[PDB]
Design an enzyme around this catalytic site. Structure first.
Site, PDB file in Angstrom:
ATOM      1  N   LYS A   1     -10.366  -0.333  -7.724  1.00 44.53           N
ATOM      2  CA  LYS A   1     -10.036  -0.193  -6.302  1.00 44.53           C
ATOM      3  C   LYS A   1     -11.134   0.574  -5.579  1.00 44.53           C
ATOM      4  CE  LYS A   1      -7.038  -1.056  -3.076  1.00 44.53           C
ATOM      5  NZ  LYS A   1      -8.120  -1.629  -2.262  1.00 44.53           N
TER       6      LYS A   1
ATOM      7  N   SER B   1      -3.766   5.101  10.601  1.00 45.92           N
ATOM      8  CA  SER B   1      -3.671   6.554  10.705  1.00 45.92           C
ATOM      9  C   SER B   1      -3.470   7.252   9.364  1.00 45.92           C
ATOM     10  CB  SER B   1      -2.525   6.940  11.648  1.00 45.92           C
ATOM     11  OG  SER B   1      -1.268   6.472  11.165  1.00 45.92           O
TER      12      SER B   1
ATOM     13  N   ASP C   1      -1.420   9.331  -8.016  1.00 49.69           N
ATOM     14  CA  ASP C   1      -0.563   8.496  -8.868  1.00 49.69           C
ATOM     15  C   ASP C   1      -0.640   7.023  -8.477  1.00 49.69           C
ATOM     16  OD1 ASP C   1       0.292  10.545 -10.469  1.00 49.69           O
ATOM     17  OD2 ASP C   1       2.241  10.781  -9.474  1.00 49.69           O
TER      18      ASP C   1
ATOM     19  N   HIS D   1       1.529  -2.337   8.062  1.00 47.50           N
ATOM     20  CA  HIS D   1       1.687  -1.378   9.152  1.00 47.50           C
ATOM     21  C   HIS D   1       1.546   0.055   8.639  1.00 47.50           C
ATOM     22  CE1 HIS D   1       3.950  -5.051  10.364  1.00 47.50           C
ATOM     23  NE2 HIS D   1       3.391  -4.806  11.539  1.00 47.50           N
TER      24      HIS D   1
ATOM     25  N   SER E   1       7.606  -8.486   3.578  1.00 45.34           N
ATOM     26  CA  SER E   1       7.335  -7.182   4.171  1.00 45.34           C
ATOM     27  C   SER E   1       8.451  -6.192   3.827  1.00 45.34           C
ATOM     28  CB  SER E   1       7.159  -7.307   5.687  1.00 45.34           C
ATOM     29  OG  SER E   1       8.226  -8.029   6.275  1.00 45.34           O
TER      30      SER E   1
ATOM     31  N   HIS F   1      -9.673   1.785 -17.302  1.00 43.91           N
ATOM     32  CA  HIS F   1      -8.520   2.194 -18.096  1.00 43.91           C
ATOM     33  C   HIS F   1      -7.234   1.664 -17.483  1.00 43.91           C
ATOM     34  CE1 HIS F   1      -8.155   5.308 -14.990  1.00 43.91           C
ATOM     35  NE2 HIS F   1      -6.918   5.498 -15.423  1.00 43.91           N
ATOM     36  N   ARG F   2      -7.248   1.406 -16.179  1.00 50.61           N
ATOM     37  CA  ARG F   2      -6.238   0.611 -15.504  1.00 50.61           C
ATOM     38  C   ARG F   2      -6.955  -0.396 -14.630  1.00 50.61           C
ATOM     39  NH1 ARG F   2      -1.045   2.797 -15.709  1.00 50.61           N
ATOM     40  NH2 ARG F   2      -0.997   5.001 -16.356  1.00 50.61           N
TER      41      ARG F   2
ATOM     42  N   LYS G   1     -16.501   0.877  -6.244  1.00 52.88           N
ATOM     43  CA  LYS G   1     -17.179   1.040  -4.960  1.00 52.88           C
ATOM     44  C   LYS G   1     -18.223  -0.062  -4.826  1.00 52.88           C
ATOM     45  CE  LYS G   1     -17.060   3.652  -1.282  1.00 52.88           C
ATOM     46  NZ  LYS G   1     -18.266   3.130  -0.565  1.00 52.88           N
TER      47      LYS G   1
ATOM     48  N   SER H   1      -3.104   1.867   0.594  1.00 52.73           N
ATOM     49  CA  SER H   1      -3.703   0.632   0.096  1.00 52.73           C
ATOM     50  C   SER H   1      -2.995   0.131  -1.160  1.00 52.73           C
ATOM     51  CB  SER H   1      -5.210   0.806  -0.162  1.00 52.73           C
ATOM     52  OG  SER H   1      -5.452   1.483  -1.376  1.00 52.73           O
TER      53      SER H   1
END
Lengths: 504, 504, 504
Positions: C93, C216, C122, C212, C399, C88-89, C129, C387
């Site tokens: 990912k 974490s 969002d 960057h 950047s 749908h989009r 996957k 991501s």
């Protein structure tokens, strides 16, 4: 004869000798950065030496011939060349010369230098260089236009022009109007479905997608490079100088774009420009020369000779040997060589030109211990930074600041009004909180060029500091050139390291 | 009959008469801007007149017919048209009408007007316009959807729909749900490999890539255009008014999207909206009408007639001749012509509609010396600015402010905390430094629409000021329309000047 | 057996049972959002139920086999799979596993979960996957590289790899160096004309376009999710706790990337991490464990066992049943099921792993009334947000902060200098206005990761608040999972609603 003792070496040989000095220093670091539990230390050193072996030679050169119709009706054949030194990042980047001195060897050597300058200012492009073998003064505007549109088509058919593959720029004998013509030819032909066609070239007129702040950018970068080094007492004391640019005396070899804009910034910074040496005459004045008057005079008479605000100087070609704090080579290459290096008395040399110092001279002056050379691939790379911003602008399809100048100005006024309300509540009287004279002037003249200026100043300070840190870490003394090549080599190598060099 | 004396001239003829007035003023300036040492002044004037000759006519029109299946099973043939007036910048830009009045001549004339409006607000698109010849009320939602998907495919096959070539928008008889359908059809068919498919059209629903702040944008631009002119005493005094919008009385012709949102902004600005004139009835109230109550009443009863907060008005079609400071034509074209211009008593006319004033009326009112017309191609171009921001947003693939609202909010709080610490150190007591009531409200409701609002306000002020500067430089008096065309022509001409017009 | 009473149900069945709970709650709202004057309420409910019927199943799965050459010269056949749950989009990912447990059913179930997690933060991507069925420890670095380049080519030929179609990421058994290899293979082959090739995958090394702050990010999102819920007294009181994270005791199941970084953030936030339970041993300390020492010890000895700063713990698999305020499941799926749910004493469960709580256990703990589960598809989605920023960065080709750090720093200093000038004028003495200690530290270390951190914190607070608002509106109590699915379903449904589902 070894390179450190030659008299007139080839430009490509100079770049590779300086490359080797940097490679030798940084090689152990490159080995340590290769993380692999599968390779021994011996294996890593063999692969690192393979990568450096591939970096030095030019990857690709395209040579073309083509007819053009002169205005009177006869036809002539024209030669041109385009070199892409490194494709480790694409597109490649570099200017186009119209000159009778263009040849394969020259576009090769300057394309190599250009890879290292892009890495020096953190600009994500491999190096390229191009040229058309003509004397542009012998042609009419109509003929120049036909030549310019033809190199656009032929280069673009083979992948030597386009926003994702290779992005040119002006150089000797070309300017912004040729750049507009190339961008228009590409958009109507090979690039007719390309959404980002105007990003195929930089140096364009503003109306066609050029960027404010480009004209003065190389000079602004020479000033900012001197300022990074003038604030360092450890180095200023070794060469017999006090910190800072105010008061320092400056002699400039060349009064082209780069020399004139460098004079403007150094004068505004408080320096005294005591000497200008050109190709046929020199002038001087130990009290300083005023930039706006000198430029006006040459504009009216045709030369800097007999400038009322200075005197003409004895054998004009010897002004660069006079005592000064700063010498700015801004003319031709190899202006400082083995036979005249000792005659140089300046404490700082700021290379505002491509390779003005041969390896023999660089070594004679490093041994004398009292002379700090700021390397060309760093200090005359200000224009390379801003050409990266122009490419970005054409990909963004909007000018910088269009959607933020009013939003940020209104936030700043609400901020100052909040401070005024809290101050008056606290001290119990009326107390205006307004922008001061400097802040009100910036707010009122806010424009794209201010974003461009700040971007450039940010990059030059960061890269200048990284050169210093590398020179201190490896005990290089005043040899900043070797430190600059080592930083540049290290960036290119890491692309190859992560892209994968296992194939061959 | 000359254009300044006709009674009902064609819309395309009005645009070209106004074009000629602007061209005559700016032509010497265009000649001076053509830098070329190869051309004489005579040559430059001949090329400038060639460029202006190419700008005026529409470059391209596509006409299509296609069958559709009605819901009951019979088939009908539908006509549609799409005009691209200028391709000097791509993509072209403009809305799509579903209406029984669409025809080739109408999409041609409004596409020309659209090129000049884009130039007026510095939006880098040539002008386009489109239309489907149907009465949308006679069709079911299923039939509207089939018609909408078919025009998407057929337009996109020929280069009249796509993010880099032509980007449409809503108009009379279409809205955001048709725009979502076109974007979905393009992405699944002709545009299936296009990374920027959702940028093929603007006016989309938010969930599909539309932009916050679009609905009220044309009204917000009418308000900001009046504010640029109301702050100028030189002009307000010539027409017998005092500076500023608070207190001024306003009559609005039309209560559609543009009229209603303009009423909201002018009321919030302190103006008194004393009269609303519609197509079948009028109302008035010399104390002012409250926007939210009027809109509520029409929402419930179906009309503005018998609004409790006002009285109905005598021959409803004559409300626009009553005394007022500001008249806002927001309905049909040529509402002010030769036979009724003298009956107009307003001191300012703000054209919130396409060409509501014919050249005859414009001249009668310029001669009367006491009436300032703010031209449509400037003052009702607020929505054109925000449609440029929606296209940008779809190319950026992220909403404005997503990566900056929290970063900038936290910097501002650390700034105020730094001021609080320094203030308390200086005066030696506790002294809170917090955002005031207005700043805390903005910080708390920060969203994409605030960036959009500031972008629009920035553009309207800059373009409004440039119109004034041009009108003063050429002694145009209160003729702001001619000044606006001259600024618009000058921008388009410079594209042609640098792209190259030497070929033909 | 019904799902709320099963013992070891399939992962895909868990996702669909939770999907149904959310769908039931939000269905009336979805009906109301379908604006159409052509459809009755009955028609709308039938179309809404069709849309939800299409959302749940996986749209596409690609399965491949291919030979590879082992280092000694024999050949082996390798299997791999890539699932795209929702288009749908686009692009879709999701990560890629190298593991002997990959199979069609597993890439299907986690691709469904991934669609809902993207909607939760969002992020405008459908869920995907992937997996390669190998034990990566049995292969040399050379063999891993050949496998990695081959899946890149084969996936990219069929539309399962590319910046506009499907964008992968690291997972168990892969890391950043495999991601660099995939990006390099795509750019040199299938993607050789793609201007945005480096955006085909995320998790890349920095030098190749990585971002960057990625390492974490999932832990930073678990901390921020607890903080959104710990500030709410209504919920903290129902479970017998006081507001805030300082002082709360925490037991963490797993010491991988997610467990270790969550420990660092929770310790820095003032919490006491009293227990770490691993796969073969556990440790504890009621005073807290210091993160840097524990990580150092395991780094040197190979395990957390016999950590000097704590004691080893009795049957290591039972540490998660001890009393604590917060339990963080950060290991395998279904770690909490029907047979051990009652033994859980934690008041808050923060699911830092994919589906660690089965529907039977989730229901036993909802009935006990004293336990607040923060759902995995929200609280371990911090890495999904960052991501999205890395993909944006590769599309921007620059950047974050490169063109703003110095411009904004200089504006802030002129702001503080304007305040200092106005303060000194008002109180009539010298009064420095400087950044305080915290502001000077941020200004000095300003870098891309600070923009990334603020972006992530913004998204988690907004989405966490929307879950709470939905749970209060539908009287869901402490069932935040059902509220989170309802928000996620609502976003996906609105894409289908405006794209058009009339065809079929």
């Amino acid at each position: 004869k070894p390179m450190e003792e030659q008299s007139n070496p080839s430009f490509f040989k100079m770049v590779d000798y300086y490359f080797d000095k940097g490679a030798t220093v940084i090689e152990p670091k490159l080995v340590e950065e290769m993380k692999s539990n599968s390779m021994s230390v011996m294996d890593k050193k063999n692969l690192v030496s393979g990568i450096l072996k591939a970096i030095k030679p030019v990857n690709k050169v395209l040579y073309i011939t083509f007819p053009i119709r002169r205005d009177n009706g006869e036809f002539e054949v024209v030669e041109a060349w385009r070199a892409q030194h490194s494709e480790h990042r694409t597109p490649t980047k570099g200017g186009i010369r119209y000159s009778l001195d263009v040849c394969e060897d020259e576009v090769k050597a300057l394309s190599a230098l250009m890879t290292y300058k892009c890495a020096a200012v953190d600009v994500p492009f491999g190096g390229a260089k191009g040229g058309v073998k003509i004397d542009p003064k012998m042609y009419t505007d109509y003929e120049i236009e036909k030549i310019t549109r033809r190199i656009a088509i032929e280069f673009a058919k083979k992948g030597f022009l386009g926003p994702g593959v290779d992005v040119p720029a002006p150089d000797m004998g070309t300017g912004e109007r040729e750049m507009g013509w190339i961008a228009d030819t590409y958009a109507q032909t090979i690039g007719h479905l390309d959404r980002d066609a105007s990003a195929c070239i930089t140096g364009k007129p503003i109306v066609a997608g050029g960027i404010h702040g480009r004209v003065s950018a190389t000079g602004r970068g020479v000033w900012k490079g001197l300022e990074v080094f003038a604030k360092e007492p450890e180095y200023m004391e070794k060469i017999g100088l006090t910190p800072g640019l105010p008061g320092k005396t400056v002699i400039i070899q060349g009064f082209g774009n780069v020399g004139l804009h460098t004079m403007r910034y150094l004068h505004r910074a408080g320096s005294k420009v005591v000497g200008i040496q050109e190709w046929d005459c020199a002038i001087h004045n130990p009290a300083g020369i005023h930039p706006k008057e000198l430029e006006d005079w040459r504009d009216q008479t045709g030369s800097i000779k007999n400038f009322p605000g200075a005197k003409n100087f004895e054998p004009f070609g010897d002004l660069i040997y006079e005592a000064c704090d700063i010498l700015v080579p801004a003319a031709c290459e190899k202006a400082i060589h083995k036979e005249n290096a000792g005659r140089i008395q300046a404490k700082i040399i700021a290379e505002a030109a491509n390779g003005p110092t041969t390896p023999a001279a660089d070594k004679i002056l490093l041994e004398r211990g009292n002379c700090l050379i700021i390397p060309d691939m760093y200090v005359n790379s200000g224009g390379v930074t801003v050409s990266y911003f122009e490419w970005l602008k054409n990909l963004n399809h909007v000018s910088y600041g269009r959607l933020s100048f009013k939003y940020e100005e209104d936030a700043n006024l609400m901020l100052l009004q909040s401070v005024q309300d809290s101050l008056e509540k606290a001290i119990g009287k009326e107390a205006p909180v307004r922008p001061n004279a400097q802040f009100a002037a910036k707010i009122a003249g806010a424009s794209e060029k201010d974003i461009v200026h700040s971007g450039l100043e940010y990059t030059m300070a960061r890269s200048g500091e990284a050169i210093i840190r590398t020179a201190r870490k490896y005990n290089l003394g005043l040899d900043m050139r070797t430190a600059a090549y080592a930083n540049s080599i290290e960036k290119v190598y890491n692309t190859y390291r992560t892209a994968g060099f296992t194939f061959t």
